[PDB]
Design an enzyme around this catalytic site. Sequence first.
Site, short mmCIF file in Angstrom:
data_model
loop_
_atom_site.label_atom_id
_atom_site.label_comp_id
_atom_site.label_asym_id
_atom_site.label_seq_id
_atom_site.Cartn_x
_atom_site.Cartn_y
_atom_site.Cartn_z
N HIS A 41 65.38 7.31 50.66
CA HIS A 41 64.33 6.32 50.85
C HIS A 41 63.37 6.22 49.69
O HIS A 41 62.47 5.40 49.70
CB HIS A 41 63.54 6.58 52.14
N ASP A 89 69.48 10.60 54.28
CA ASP A 89 68.26 10.43 53.50
C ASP A 89 68.46 11.33 52.32
O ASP A 89 67.88 12.41 52.27
CB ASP A 89 67.05 10.89 54.32
N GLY A 169 52.02 12.55 50.29
CA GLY A 169 51.57 12.92 48.95
C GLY A 169 52.74 12.96 47.97
O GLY A 169 52.91 12.11 47.10
N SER A 171 55.89 12.55 48.57
CA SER A 171 57.03 12.04 49.32
C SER A 171 58.36 12.57 48.76
O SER A 171 58.62 12.56 47.57
CB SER A 171 57.01 10.51 49.23
N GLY A 172 59.19 13.09 49.69
CA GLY A 172 60.48 13.63 49.27
C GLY A 172 60.33 14.98 48.57
O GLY A 172 61.17 15.40 47.79
#
Lengths: 223, 336, 30
Positions: A41, A89, A169, A171-172
Amino acid sequence: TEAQRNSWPSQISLQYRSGSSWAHTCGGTLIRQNWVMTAAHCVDRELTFRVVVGEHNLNQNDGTEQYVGVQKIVVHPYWNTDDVAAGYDIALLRLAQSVTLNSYVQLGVLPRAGTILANNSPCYITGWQLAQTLQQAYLPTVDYAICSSSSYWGSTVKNSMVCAGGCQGDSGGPLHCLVNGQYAVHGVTSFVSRLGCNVTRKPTVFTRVSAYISWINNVIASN
Amino acid sequence: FNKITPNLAEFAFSLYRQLAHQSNSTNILFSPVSIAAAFAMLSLGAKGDTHDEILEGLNFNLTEIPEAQIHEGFQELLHTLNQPDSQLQLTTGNGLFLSEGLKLVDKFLEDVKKLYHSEAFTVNFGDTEEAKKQINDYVEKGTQGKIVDLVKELDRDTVFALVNYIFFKGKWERPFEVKDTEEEDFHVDQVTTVKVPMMKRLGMFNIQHSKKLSSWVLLMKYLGNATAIFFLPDEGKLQHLENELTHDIITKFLENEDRRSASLHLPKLSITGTYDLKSVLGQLGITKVFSNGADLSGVTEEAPLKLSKAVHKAVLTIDEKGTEAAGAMFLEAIPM
Amino acid sequence: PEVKFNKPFVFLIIEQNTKAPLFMGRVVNP
């Protein structure tokens, strides 16, 4: 808290170009001199990205850093934003230029295929008066049976995933774990509750990278 | 000869025309202006498929009216609103909170403060117990106490928060008699019934009855050039009104001044309205800002923040003296 | 012309100068 300057020599910062600079987005571990692993994503929209190795503050340049664009990205064929809970994901971005594995930028290490993590199994979630710099936190895992229970996430949480804690913050942001000695990356943030991370009985959920290892091989090998 | 008001009315319906399909026995009550002026203010920072979805997504179609008017024709709509007269009191206020010395695009910080006269307050989102209180202390200082707590919980990682306030106190230039107001039974539903201080008055009114909308249209006024327009559906022919309300018809009414002496009974009111656009807005074509494509370039350049939730509120009061409503809207933006 | 409002319906406040739609709502069961 904050992580030691060069604590994770395989940590990565996928940044997006906006105006005249680059904006941080997702974390992502390093897997080989020319492939970085992140969330799917993340390379979601058609932005043009680049990745930085051996970084701590995405606003300053301690020289002990290294930038590099990504030729082409490859997301799991079975990934779809709509249904994120479906898993998948996970993406593998290829770096235009390989790199030097400095005393500050080694590679990352993934778990064995089919390996399942136990509960209360320590793990740390790293990422990005305060502002911006590589932080880290303690985020214990949650036994699959639990997360799945209708008292936590329910069906959503699958076996091709990992529940810690129970965020925003970086992300991932990758999830490291200590499986009796080893310390490879067991997961990469997939999604969080819809209230963020104050919601109990509902932990952030990571993708079971090990659930996509044989995959990674087929991929990086197909080049 | 500015305007962009019609598009804002249609919005008023498109949105209401929604909550009308969800429920039927609930009391609806929001405030366009407030809302469609927060997203507009956000649209100085919104970009691409985001800016687009959260704009035309409110009947403010691009291909027809340039952003300039969308915007200029707003800084005039609120500028000429916040500056009323003595017998009436229409006040509205804007204001967004974000960390001090933040990564605020320079060009964006001038727009909302110029085209909206909004106020920039650098909030320390660390200890939310200092944010989710300071902010709610701004609306209540404007809603003259109407809303001294428009926010309970917010995310700690909430990168940004946008909020505006709106108070109003109007007076019927022709007030109902505090005495004539008798205690009657409100024909709730086909069974239920409550008691409410029903107001009464006889004499000429702008009341009317057309087929299209099918209902009794009463356009009572206020001292200060205002008009509360009430609609009385037909015995059962209610759903008709909800799905028959438009700007083309009303504007005709706000121009029928002709009167006809008659009898009227209006009960005292005092309802409250709170909800989360999160959904509605989406179902209205605004999930784009609430999705994995949060183009908030204009807002900030530091890191990608996002549309977390929509928090609207509104308070209405009706009596023999007049009306004194109020309301607001709250926006939260956090990372990707 | 005997008209009374003792049931659910829809009201709507408005600015005269700027034909603005200040508030808007429908009272059903007070």
